[PDB]
Paper text:
Cilium assembly and maintenance require multi-subunit intraflagellar transport (IFT) protein complexes: IFT-A and IFT-B, which form repetitive structures known as the IFT trains. IFT-A is also essential for transporting key membrane or membrane-associated proteins, such as GPCRs, ion channels and lipidated proteins, into cilia.
We co-purified the IFT-A–TULP3 complex for cryo-EM analysis and found an extra density next to IFT140 and IFT122 which is corresponding to TULP3. We excluded IFT139 to simplify structural determination, as it is not involved in TULP3 interaction. TULP3 interacts with the TPR-like domain of IFT140 and the TPR-like and zinc finger domains of IFT122 via its N-terminal region. By stably expressing wild-type (WT) and helical/loop mutants of TULP3 in a Tulp3 KO IMCD3 cell line, we monitored the ciliary levels of ARL13B (a palmitoylated cargo) and GPR161, whose ciliary transportation is dependent on TULP3.18,22,23,54,55 We determined that mutations in the TULP3 helical region (K41A/K42A/R43A), loop region (F47D/V49D) or a combination of both (K41A/K42A/V49D) could significantly disrupt TULP3–IFT-A interaction and reduce ARL13B and GPR161 trafficking to cilia.
Numbering used by the authors:
A (entry chain B): 870 to 993
B (entry chain C): 561 to 895
C (entry chain E): 407 to 422, 427 to 438, 447 to 459, 483 to 507, 511 to 518, 521 to 566, 571 to 584, 586 to 589, ...
């Protein structure tokens, strides 16, 4: 909470996670992802989702909620892949220049379109 | 026909013939489908021939060599408006709205400072699928329950689905249904009907799309008729409404049939509710129905039976028989 | 002069002498007006009841045409007569009065002699249509108002200063009072600050006294003339009659007698806490206005269960979907606040958000409204999580308003400028 009131929220989430917190860590991490998705930082959105995925699987170490957390793990992993993919497309259609090779954008776009048929995660 | 050359103007094209210049305006993206709309007219000095249009200036050659300029009547907002008056700005606002010139419309509304003028601009901006600029307008109007809604559906990319949403926000539900049934997620039209409380169309749309809503929307429609007053078609729907998983829902439909038919002449066919009642709650609701139709028959019965059992004393004071009242006198909390 | 004005049976007469028959909308010491006969008055008070006169001579009640019936007081001079419905109350300034029934051929005493002083001068007297309710005790008027229940035979006194009802608004004193010409339980009062405010009450035997309406006197109005469905009628300061539709009855002015009766039933069950009776009474009325009205009743009574069916009947599908979504939210005040936002009352929504403690929702609410600055307040002190995000949205808006210096600034504060 010292980092939190000091606005060091990334480190704060890391702290709660390392501190056995499983109510503060998840809530602050979801809030951070929502902030990242709100802006154009889709790559950070993907990385935070990835952290959620592995942390939630760690929480699923508890046999009580194994069934109701493997689902969350799989869902967040898929979201992580999708957003890290979509970051390149977001950059490509905004900057006056281009960074990636055409082959890579082609492959990314095809994978996205064949993994996002009818439901669009926020921002995509 | 000279198309509009100015970069920011989408699709305007004055046609022109002899002593007139019309100001047609294409409309690619609207809720009601695409169409072409006349915006106005003008007049051209005799012996002239248009060559170019740009922001409204119809560079037109004369019958001698010199290119005179004209000003379209339809595009008159270009100049300042301190000279213009409210009675002069209002039609100017309408013209700018037709031309899809939203920036000038915003400027002129800011000058006018009329709430209804801003509201008209907002309705136009919804009508043309301009979600962002409509949000900008509403955020100034102050209307909050629509700012949040529009910010909610700003993500939608599907053309017909977005069309249906922006239709619903313009309180045209029929066209909303029409578009939603063409979008990727038709069940949204269902959701609209079910929220909008028109359960008959809810059944129609659901049956074609979802079968899970069928018994539950049937139950809701039956209850709608029951609170309204009908109790025959309501009972029939209740029969239709019985599911096989939600014992709550199931016995609820059973109680429905019980009460609606009991209101009908069914002391024999609502006589089931003497038995069909699966909860003391059901019994006491039947006690309400058995103070409903001037019962001795089964005011007597359900106040002798139900958790409303002391009530049999009044159910039987209605009658002569004192067995119930006297025997219940120990089993009563109202001396 | 005192300007003696009266209102009865949709007829308003004020000394000038303007008489308005508002049913047909025709405008032409005391004056009394009915539909057919207008009484100008040796009496402290006189009245026509069809062809009858209520002459109060010495300690007696007399009748003559245009000597028919006689009534005997044993009790001082009455100087108060009031005919409403088919009942008359004849009141004195000596804490004495009676109620005489009129449904028969002649005046007959429905209630016996009484003394207010035993139960509690009298300022003014009025009656209900049913006549079971008969008052301002006193020569200046007093804050307390007394009501004598004929049937159960006691008295009820309501104190303006204390807001308390004794069975046998704190700086206002009742000065004038009238009754509705259709509902015996509907009572109204004009109270002047010791400025002038009009208080309408519903007298429920099973519940007591209820606060129905409380609105300040109109600027064009100076005295409370009375009411008749669906308008509060006042004397206009120099048509000299001002009719104000009742707050619940806004929009049902041209509805039928039975439609207005249903609206009255809803209004009564609103005066009581029976939302259920109110709604079940209003089940065959297709005007969006009524549903909107009880759909702010729901707001004022944190009862969303019946709300959902309502804003269906009103065509406000947007709001219904909003409620459906907000149902996810884990709070009770929160859903009510969302509902209120959907139905034209931002301020109450702000209040319930404040009390709910769901400050992040308050933040979004201010952002939705043009409260772009209050938003930064709630972000600065309460969320500290959307502060980056609140700053960002503000920067975006600033870019939207074509001001790209403050926009740069908030880009840099949000750390997104990069």
């Amino acid at each position: 909470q010292w980092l939190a009131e000091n606005d060091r929220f990334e480190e704060a989430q890391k702290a709660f996670h390392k501190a056995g917190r499983q109510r503060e860590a998840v809530q602050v991490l979801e809030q951070l992802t929502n902030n990242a998705v709100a802006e154009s930082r889709f790559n950070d959105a993907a990385y935070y989702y990835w952290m959620l995925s592995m942390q939630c699987l760690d929480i699923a170490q508890d046999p009580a909620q194994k069934d109701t957390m493997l689902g969350k793990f799989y869902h967040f992993q898929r979201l992580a892949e999708l957003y890290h993919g979509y970051h390149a497309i977001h950059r490509h259609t905004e900057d006056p220049f281009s960074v990636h090779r055409p082959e890579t954008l082609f492959n990314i776009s095809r994978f996205l379109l064949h993994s996002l048929p009818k439901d669009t995660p926020s921002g995509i | 026909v000279l198309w509009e050359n100015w970069p920011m103007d989408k699709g305007v094209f004055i046609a022109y013939d002899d002593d007139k210049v019309y100001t047609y305006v294409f409309h690619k993206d609207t809720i009601q489908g695409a169409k072409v709309i006349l915006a106005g007219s003008t007049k051209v000095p005799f012996a002239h021939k248009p060559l170019l249009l740009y922001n409204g200036e119809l560079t037109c050659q004369t019958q001698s060599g010199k290119v005179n300029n004209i000003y379209l009547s339809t595009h008159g907002f270009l100049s300042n408006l301190k000279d213009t008056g409210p009675d002069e700005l209002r039609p100017m606002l309408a013209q700018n709205l037709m031309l899809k010139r939203f920036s000038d419309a915003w400027e002129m509304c800011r000058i006018l400072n009329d709430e209804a003028a801003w509201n008209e601009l907002a309705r136009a901006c919804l009508h043309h699928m301009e979600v962002e600029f409509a949000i900008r307008v509403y955020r100034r109007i102050g209307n909050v329950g629509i700012v949040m809604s529009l910010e909610q559906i700003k993500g939608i990319e599907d053309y017909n689905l977005l069309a249906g949403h922006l239709a619903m926000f313009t309180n045209d539900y029929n066209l909303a249904q029409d578009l939603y049934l063409a979008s990727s997620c038709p069940i949204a039209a269902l959701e609209m009907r079910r929220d909008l409380q028109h359960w008959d169309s809810a059944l129609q749309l659901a049956k074609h799309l979802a079968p899970d809503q069928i018994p539950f929307i049937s139950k809701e429609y039956a209850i709608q008729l029951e609170f309204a007053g009908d109790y025959v078609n309501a009972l029939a729907h209740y029969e239709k409404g019985i599911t096989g998983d939600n014992k709550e829902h199931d016995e609820a439909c059973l109680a429905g049939v019980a009460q609606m038919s009991i209101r009908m002449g069914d002391i024999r066919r609502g006589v089931n509710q003497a038995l069909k009642h699966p909860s003391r709650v059901l019994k006491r609701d039947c006690g309400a129905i058995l103070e409903n139709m001037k019962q001795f028959s089964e005011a007597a019965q359900l106040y002798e039976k139900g958790l409303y059992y002391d009530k049999a004393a009044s159910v039987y004071i209605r009658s002569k028989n004192w067995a119930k009242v006297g025997d219940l006198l120990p089993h009563v909390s109202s001396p | 002069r005192a300007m003696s004005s009266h209102f009865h049976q949709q007829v308003a007469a004020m000394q000038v002498l303007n008489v308005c028959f508002l049913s047909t909308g025709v405008a032409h010491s005391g004056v009394f007006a009915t539909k057919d006969a207008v009484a100008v008055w040796e009496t402290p008070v006189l009245a026509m009841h069809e062809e009858n006169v209520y002459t109060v001579e010495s300690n007696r009640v007399q009748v003559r045409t245009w000597v028919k019936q006689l009534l005997l007081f044993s009790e001082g001079n009455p100087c108060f007569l009031d005919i409403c419905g088919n009942f008359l109350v004849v009141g004195t300034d000596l804490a004495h009065f009676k109620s005489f029934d009129l449904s028969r051929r002649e005046a007959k005493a429905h209630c016996s002699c009484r003394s207010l002083a035993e139960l509690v001068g009298i300022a003014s007297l009025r009656c209900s249509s049913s006549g079971s309710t008969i008052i301002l005790p006193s020569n200046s008027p007093d804050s307390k108002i007394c009501f004598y229940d004929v049937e159960m035979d006691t008295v009820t006194v309501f104190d303006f200063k204390t807001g308390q009802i004794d069975r046998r608004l704190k700086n206002y004193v009742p000065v004038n009072h009238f009754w509705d010409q259709s509902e015996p339980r509907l009572f109204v009062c004009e109270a002047v600050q010791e400025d002038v405010l009009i208080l309408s009450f519903f007298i429920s035997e099973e519940h007591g006294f209820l606060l129905h309406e409380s609105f300040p006197r109109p600027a064009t109005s100076h005295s409370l003339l009375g009411m008749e469905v669906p308008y509060y009628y006042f004397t206009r300061k120099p048509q000299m009659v001002s009719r104000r539709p009742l707050r619940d009855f806004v929009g049902l002015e041209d509805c039928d007698k039975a439609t207005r009766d249903a609206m009255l039933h809803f209004s009564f069950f609103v005066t009581i806490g029976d939302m259920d009776e109110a709604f079940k009474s209003i089940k065959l009325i297709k005007s969006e206005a009524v549903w909107e009205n009880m759909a702010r009743m729901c707001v004022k009574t944190q009862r969303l269960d019946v709300a959902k069916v309502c804003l269906g009947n009103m065509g406000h599908a947007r709001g219904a979907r909003a409620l459906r979504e907000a149902e996810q939210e884990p709070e009770l005040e929160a859903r009510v606040a969302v509902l209120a936002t959907q139905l034209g009352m931002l301020e109450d929504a702000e209040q319930l958000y404040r009390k709910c403690k769901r400050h992040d929702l308050l933040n979004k609410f201010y952002q939705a409204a043009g409260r772009w600055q209050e938003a930064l307040q709630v972000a600065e002190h309460h969320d500290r999580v959307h502060l980056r995000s609140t700053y960002h949205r503000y920067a975006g808006h600033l870019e939207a308003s074509a001001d790209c210096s403050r926009a740069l600034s908030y880009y840099e504060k949000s750390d997104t400028h990069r």
